[PDB]
Amino acid sequence: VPTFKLVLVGDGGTGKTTFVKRHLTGEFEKKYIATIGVEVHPLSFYTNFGEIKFDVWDTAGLEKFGGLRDGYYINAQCAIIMFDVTSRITYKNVPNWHRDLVRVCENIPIVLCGNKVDVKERKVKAKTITFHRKKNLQYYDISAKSNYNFEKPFLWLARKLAGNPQLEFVASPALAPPMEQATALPLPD
Amino acid sequence: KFVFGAASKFGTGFAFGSGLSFGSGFNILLQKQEVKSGEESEECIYQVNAKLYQLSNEGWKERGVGIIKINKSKDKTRIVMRSRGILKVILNIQLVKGFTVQKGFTGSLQSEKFIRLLAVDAQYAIKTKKETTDELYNIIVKSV
Amino acid sequence: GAMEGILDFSNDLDIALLDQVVSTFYQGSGVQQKQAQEILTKFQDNPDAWQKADQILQFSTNPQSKFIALSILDKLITRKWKLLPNDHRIGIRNFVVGMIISMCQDDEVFKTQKNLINKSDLTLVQILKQEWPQNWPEFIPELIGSSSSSVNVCENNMIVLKLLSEEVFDFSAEQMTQAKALHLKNSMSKEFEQIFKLCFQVLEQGSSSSLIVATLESLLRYLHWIPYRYIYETNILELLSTKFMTSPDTRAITLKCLTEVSNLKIPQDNDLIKRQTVLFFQNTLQQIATSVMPVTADLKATYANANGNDQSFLQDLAMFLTTYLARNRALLESDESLRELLLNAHQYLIQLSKIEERELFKTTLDYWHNLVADLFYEPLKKHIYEEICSQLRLVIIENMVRPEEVLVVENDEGEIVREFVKESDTIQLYKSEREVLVYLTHLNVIDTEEIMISKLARQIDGSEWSWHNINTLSWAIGSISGTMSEDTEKRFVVTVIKDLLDLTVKKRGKDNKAVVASDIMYVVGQYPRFLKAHWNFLRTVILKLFEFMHETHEGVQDMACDTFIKIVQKCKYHFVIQQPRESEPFIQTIIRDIQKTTADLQPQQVHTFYKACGIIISEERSVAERNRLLSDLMQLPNMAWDTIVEQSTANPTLLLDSETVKIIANIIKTNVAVCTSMGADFYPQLGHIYYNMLQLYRAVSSMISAQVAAEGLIATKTPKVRGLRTIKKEILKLVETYISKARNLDDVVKVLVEPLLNAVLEDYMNNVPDARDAEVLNCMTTVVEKVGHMIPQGVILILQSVFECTLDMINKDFTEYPEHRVEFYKLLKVINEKSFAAFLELPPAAFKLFVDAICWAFKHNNRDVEVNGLQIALDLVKNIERMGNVPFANEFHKNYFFIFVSETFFVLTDSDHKSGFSKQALLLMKLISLVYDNKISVPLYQEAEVPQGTSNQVYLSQYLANMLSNAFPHLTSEQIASFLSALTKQYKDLVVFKGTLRDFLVQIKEVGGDPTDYLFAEDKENALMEQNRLEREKAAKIGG
Ligand SMILES: Nc1nc2c(ncn2[C@@H]2O[C@H](COP(=O)(O)OP(=O)(O)OP(=O)(O)O)[C@@H](O)[C@H]2O)c(=O)[nH]1
């Protein structure tokens, strides 16, 4: 069962860690706690080509928490670049993240993700988002908050890695299984 | 840290490589298609699209949206839930004797669409349309 | 543990320890990986780690350790290089070159350590940005010289040189000063002859695939900037369009080269260059057809197969064809012998446009928009593309995506569901598709109709029936509304509708019904012109919508409400008149049946129905008949409202029953819906409920106060109180909605406002922090925006009631009460704009609270808050300047000027507020102008501070030099002097001023910037006047 290293880069505040957390626990993290260097999390699912395992390397986007920076990209077999359609500067910075990444990893599949599309006042409009075209990156509008397209970066990446667009998610195996104070607590959503 | 009344403390006042060989400078001139098994040689009685929460102490967290399934094991019963799209297992519980399932959730307006529950690793809350939340309850209740 | 041993610098660096910490981090996992990561960061960041990098690079056995060593040095080179003695600068530069050569001259290393070789060449490049050419004039010739030693080194040199071009032309802006960028660009341009000599040589006489590809990779970057003559006046256009398109390995990169070649600065009136632009396009297209695929290839099938780099190749083909054809198609358009080239290239685009890949499809669609709009404006070129266009009708029709108005969609288990989320990407694509299709239709209305009628016949005969095909066809049909004459449209629409109802009968079950129902809805709502000429049809459509509102499918209900709105928004005239053969306006019939029509709707949908009825009513232009229709529409909510007011007044405890709270919220939101389309004409209904509504507000408020006493703070968290607070938020939205659309403002001021403030302000001021509703602030904001001018004293009262107490919730940190925080600064912003006099009346202790709240706003990372802070500062400053030479204005400047200056400089300059840059710059520029335009009447200094008679200008620069000296002591005084000299001369020119800010921001990061960099703009203007004088003399010479 192979494991693929996925690097996740982009400006701070753009929803990188929120996006990983969504996939890991199902939760939606409201606070911004800036990542410091990198955080690594295993992450898997099943497909008709078997189990697919990513080692997600969730890097810091704030320059002062940069850590080993491009030293995090060594041996990545794929990547996601993340910006915030609510914030122009984060899309303006997408070529820098892409530049540093490809200098380290020459020939890997890379997804551009424009996140937070659930926010009414969008600032980076669809017609501005062109960068991926000349660079052969896949692009998705996503939302970690509403789950819009949040599985798509993973499906596309797994299809590239397996070299087979026939790849699809299948059901993970369900194997054999092994108050009053709560009812009036508020609900996150 | 930043302090509200305070003026910003902005402009306050008050031999490399020598011993070594290079050194010299210019002078040195598979995945294959498989089959995964659901792990189900059981039958699916009732299924509905659902939203799941978990509480392990504050507070309630989201956990997944997907199809919750009650499965009859061609004999034993269990609950199976999967996250939509990625299709990971987020709920898998044997329906054993002495099992507590309560209708309702009060701290939420839609609380008549809710159901709560206790399981092996804390508690879970499922949400469904009211008619379907009752169906899920009675179908679950019926068992063991 | 032991891994941290590498952080102990009193001992010699144990490299085998480093290597093991490094491996633990890259090849390890869990807690060990995470602690190693911490140790490694601290190791790279030690300001003396560079001293260790030579030994690491010479002796380490771990490629990843050496990568980290190069980063250590990158940090030294980029920021501290000029502090090095010559000994070190020369030694580091040699060592780096040496190492690069050794890795290249070892085949296995050069085969397997690419990422490490590439990091080293980048490090070399960073040394060239510090050292070249002025302290390494011989480098480029030597590097070019070395190329002949081996194929490996030659290949690598292409990398170095590609890297260098990147850093100089592609990524220099805001990474270096503008003057360093110019200098390096000038330096590279003066050595490009020799660079090109080498790159061309390898391109003609080279065998190694890998070496040709790296050379082409470099060529790609050179084409971003080099003079046209290197492309056109050599044979390279031929070698790219012919041999390098021919060989499989070189083909992707060549296509990207020819794409940028398309974009080069071209002489427009050079007919040999025209002929060359034609020729390369001709060569490339011929090579595709010969060596890759013919124009009849099914590129849709080819892409879906995804073999090798086919998908990238096919994206690059699209990019090349669209780039070249949108710049150059007219080149091909008149010479008959070029006609087939022209059309084969567009045929290639037709085939790419069938690929199933949304982004690629957007790339081709943009081009098609460019093509067909051009033909709409030049219709005489229309015939050249007739058969391109007509195939494209088919492509566009078949690939329409879902319009935002369609709310029915297919889930994963093959079911038809209510849409879960709005999809902004899908919405924008639909809209781009619509425009193209509207264009195609105008090009040929009869062919479009014919194709659409045919496709629909294949929907009825079942030959092409599917959800997907009936949907895209329906969307395509709705999309062209407006393209036909009214008479054609009439026949078209009748056929469509009849075919859709024909499908309605044959295709049964919930899923098929909801699909077809959504298609009929979408079509009828897009054709209002037709519905307006055919009353019995309009009428019938509305009645069909009413039926749909009873469907159990929720998406069908939601869509029927929204279609109703969409139709009445255009057709409302037709519901207020009495039609022939009817006894009443249809609005009265609608209003009468309301209970029945909406019986199966959910609250939110019931609301949308009242809102649509509201749109119709405002069409009745007789006030009395209008107020009577409203009264009549509001009959059921007013009925429910009178009952619940009577009851809850008698028994305030009903306000605790969640069922009472739902009743009230929805009554109020029904009022909000009608008010939203009625606006100014809503007033009679607002007056009808206004008195009992504000009593309700007051009663709810003390219910809350009864539960806060009996249960303390945690009271705020219980569903009882949250229910109570909802009545209050909903009342406030109703009041905001009305006031925001009011036209009679005397009535707002004399009837509405005082009872409002009365019911709202003390309740908020005196409540516990956790029970204050942010909606109070939002409501006040609208009061101020709308009528503030008319109520000086009311604004003072609002300011007083919310200011200090709200400020107390939000001045401890940046995250508590985020809604309150956002609303607060929006409120401050509007008061500061519409009624500045309210701040003039604050005692001086509170006016200082005002400034502090502002400077706090600019230290947020929240951009919503941040943005308003800077805007407020600018508006305050402007408001102060507006007052002229006057005691308050003068005191403000003596008290606050320098606080604004240095607070702005702080966020501008610390690396945490980079989104604010432009508005900080505007603020800095205005403060500067206050001094340099002699707009401040009074000295900014106290007599103690300066020589008698010092000017404000001199005081301003000394103040800032010294402030800047303290913040960045690594700057020389000449840098600071030149920066401020530039700023105080640039304060009237936003673009030039910002560049200098950018320049400064680079220089505070490094030691030893050139203080002459700040004369960029000045130098530029002088270099331009020498160019114009030399142009003038040429022209004199040219003719006597
Ligand atoms: N509205 C909305 N907010 C989101 C979404 N995703 C993330 N956020 C918010 O964005 C903020 C920043 O989240 P992070 O995930 O911590 O940011 P990061 O990208 O990890 O940043 P660094 O770790 O600093 O590079 C959090 O408050 C999130 O809850 C989304 O899809 N929609």
Ligand SMILES: [Mg+2]
């Ligand atoms: Mg993070």
